[PDB]
């Protein structure tokens, strides 16, 4: 159901995406810039636990390829990225605190979606 | 695409839903128990700002009526509820702090989804 709102809402999503990637948030966004390299980090159970990896460079490639048909699809991916982090890591890990901070940035601006 | 996982994942979702409704979290979940009554609260702009209201009693009715076909649909509704709160209220409002606490409960247990 391609709504006329979809392109305008996808622009807002792209703006959020640019912000998450910006230096404003780099101190806590950086773990999510690129796909988790499980072997390089010694996390040999990561791909058994996480069945759908996601990261901001993948979200960016999808946006640039016009893969997302609506804001909801884009939001599901960004939230999947954070969920994977909450699934794999103990709740008191530093990367979890970073994920919650970035997700806070994401959720509050996603909530400002034009409609 | 009804996967064989969908009913088992929908059980996990129903467990999350029961937990969000439980007395364990009542001190911060209560604003989300029932649909926002905008007139009763004097929020005469609420339904201009919020185009898709959502609350836990609606999520519960949908679950009981077998409206959700998958965990993703259920998660989109719960997150919509929180997003509506972040959209309408100033970020330093008490209800926003409550929403973030409840959403924390939701996201960390949603991340434990069987798969
Ligand atoms: O989201 C994650 N991002 C990262 N980034 C990362 C961390 C250290 C070095 C480099 Cl090059 C990248 O690593 C993770 C490790 C674990 Cl255990 O879980 C995760 O969810 C993530
Ligand atoms: O989610 C919300 N839940 C509530 N509950 C609520 C608040 C006071 C009394 C009663 Cl009976 C219910 O009120 C809200 C007011 C505003 Cl401004 O925004 C909101 O998002 C919400």
UniProtKB/Swiss-Prot annotation, chains A, B:
The first bromo domain specifically recognizes histone H4 acetylated at 'Lys-12' (H4K12ac). It also specifically binds histone H4 acetyl-methylated at 'Lys-5' and 'Lys-12' (H4K5acme and H4K12acme, respectively). The second bromo domain recognizes and binds histone H4 acetylated at 'Lys-5' and 'Lys-12' (H4K5ac and H4K12ac, respectively). Homodimer. Interacts with E2F1. Interacts with (acetylated) STAT3; promoting STAT3 recruitment to chromatin. Interacts with CTCF; promoting BRD2 recruitment to chromatin. Belongs to the BET family. This is Bromodomain-containing protein 2. Residues 8-113 form the Bromo domain. It comes from Homo sapiens. The chain holds residues 348 to 455 of 801 of the full protein. Changing residue 41 to A: Reduced binding to histone H4 acetylated at 'Lys-12' (H4K12ac). It is found in: Nucleus; Chromosome. It comes from the Eukaryota. The lineage of its organism: Eukaryota, Metazoa, Chordata, Craniata, Vertebrata. Chromatin reader protein that specifically recognizes and binds histone H4 acetylated at 'Lys-5' and 'Lys-12' (H4K5ac and H4K12ac, respectively), thereby controlling gene expression and remodeling chromatin structures. Recruits transcription factors and coactivators to target gene sites, and activates RNA polymerase II machinery for transcriptional elongation. Some specific inhibitors of BRD2 that prevent binding to acetylated histone are promising therapeutic molecules for the treatment of cancers or inflammatory diseases. ABBV-744, a small molecule, has been tested on tumors with success: ABBV-744 antiproliferative activity is mainly restricted to cell lines of acute myeloid leukaemia and prostate cancer and is able to displace BRD4 from chromatin. GSK046 (iBET-BD2), which specifically inhibits the second bromo domain, is a promising therapeutic small molecule for the treatment of inflammatory and autoimmune diseases.
